[PDB]
Design a binder for this molecule. Structure first.
Ligand SMILES: Cc1cc2nc3c(=O)[nH]c(=O)nc-3n(C[C@H](O)[C@H](O)[C@H](O)COP(=O)(O)O)c2cc1C
Ligand SMILES: Cc1cc2nc3c(=O)[nH]c(=O)nc-3n(C[C@H](O)[C@H](O)[C@H](O)COP(=O)(O)O)c2cc1C
Lengths: 227, 232
């Protein structure tokens, strides 16, 4: 398979993916294919390798309906998706140099050596100097959470792209009332005693209609070169 | 169906193999350049990325100039190996807060002329307390501050970042996403350079591309049963 053919195959998948408004309600993604989609999320990169996310697969019909009542952007997708995913981000209290989540992730998952960890997590060490001085994430809980949320959008993109590469449609979803969705998930136990908060949603399934032609700004509008 | 099962599994494997191949590459081969065709393909993956309300609130700046790369390196603790050696270095900019409201020219022209949104739909989208405002203000609280609106834009840019990295890896090209820079100092450099276009853009995140010179340590992630929960 020539490398030019491979590139065309990949662009074809980027063209195939679209913001699918409704899915076939009688065609379910296989367990294997869906596990593959989740793995694309799991393997995604994240800042400082902290993987500050959780993927909640909402198949429960009552919870889908509770969400649909407060998600203006998901009216066709929530009832019809084969699989529906809440991308949660770790909350601000989970992400600082003295949070237990950070220490356990770096030590037990990333296998960071003890000396490297101490320089990473010391006062005015690598993590704090970056979070505070460089990126100003101590300015509020929201600033820290929105940075977490950016990391979840990498996982979002990779899940939709993986799906599209094997012919499965998706729709990313922000069209929901944050306060009401937060309250629903908090009351349901889904946010795990304030460890998580909702970032973004994603539906997956098979299209029912062909979409309108894709539109984007031109490459020469959006790319600048500094030579 | 056995033979079909193996072909489907092998295609999935190819994709997983690219996800395993991609890693946060710390330095690149200073002599081996990505082809013009291959790099345009990487950019196209960025261009074809989805974005909230289809507003594509990004600009990609390819910084090949050695002097500017070095200015950025002086204030980018996370990019010490990547800036001097990368084949291609990309600044992902996001539109700033006043570009992104319902009656901003950027939004109006993007939805009318690129998205071709018909008149009745665009009216409902962009009127006072219409679809966009109700979402931006009431739902997501983006009117709260310039930073809230910019960070929402910046999230969209991370979609393009992820897709550029994955496209590159699928054709054997390494990359590294880069946040390790001082925002204030980088902002000022780009502002003086003219790259932020009279305040219409600000820096979101960086990305280096090229060919590895060393093999990475084994990739590590949390287990699937740690990060995935089912509500059935
Ligand atoms: C948004 C973002 C910013 C990052 N910033 C940097 C950086 O400035 N320098 C760096 O060497 N690595 C950076 N990383 C790399 C992460 O440390 C790395 O992706 C993570 O530890 C997982 O490792 P892998 O990408 O090798 O699988 C960044 C990653 C992401 C997603
Ligand atoms: C983060 C994000 C959130 C989105 N929210 C919604 C939504 O709530 N409902 C919806 O129908 N489409 C939603 N969209 C789809 C966008 O309108 C769509 O991706 C964009 O217009 C480009 O079209 P395409 O994905 O068909 O190429 C969202 C897209 C993204 C990236």
């Amino acid at each position: 398979m020539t490398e030019q053919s491979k590139k065309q195959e990949i662009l074809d998948a980027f063209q195939f993916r679209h913001a699918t408004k409704e899915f076939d309600p009688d065609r379910k993604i296989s367990d294997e294919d869906f596990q593959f989609i989740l793995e694309a999320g799991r393997l995604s990169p994240s800042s400082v390798g902290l993987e500050p996310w959780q993927f909640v697969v909402v198949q429960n019909k009552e919870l889908r309906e509770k969400l649909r009542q407060v998600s203006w952007g998901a009216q066709g997708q929530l009832p019809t998706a084969s699989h529906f995913v809440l991308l949660l981000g770790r909350t601000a209290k989970e992400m600082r140099r003295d949070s237990g989540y950070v220490a356990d992730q770096l030590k037990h998952v990333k296998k960071m050596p003890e000396d490297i960890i101490e320089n990473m997590l010391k006062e005015d060490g690598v993590l704090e100097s970056f979070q505070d001085g460089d990126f100003h994430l101590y300015e509020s809980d929201r600033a820290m959470f929105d940075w977490v949320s950016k990391q979840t959008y990498i996982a979002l993109a990779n899940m939709m792209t993986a799906a599209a590469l094997i012919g499965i449609d998706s729709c990313p979803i922000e069209g929901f009332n944050y306060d009401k969705v937060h309250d629903i998930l908090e009351k349901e136990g889904v946010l795990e005693d304030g460890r998580f908060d909702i970032s973004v949603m994603a539906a997956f399934g098979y299209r029912v209609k062909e979409p309108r032609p894709k539109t984007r700004r031109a490459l020469d509008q959006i790319v600048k070169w500094v030579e």
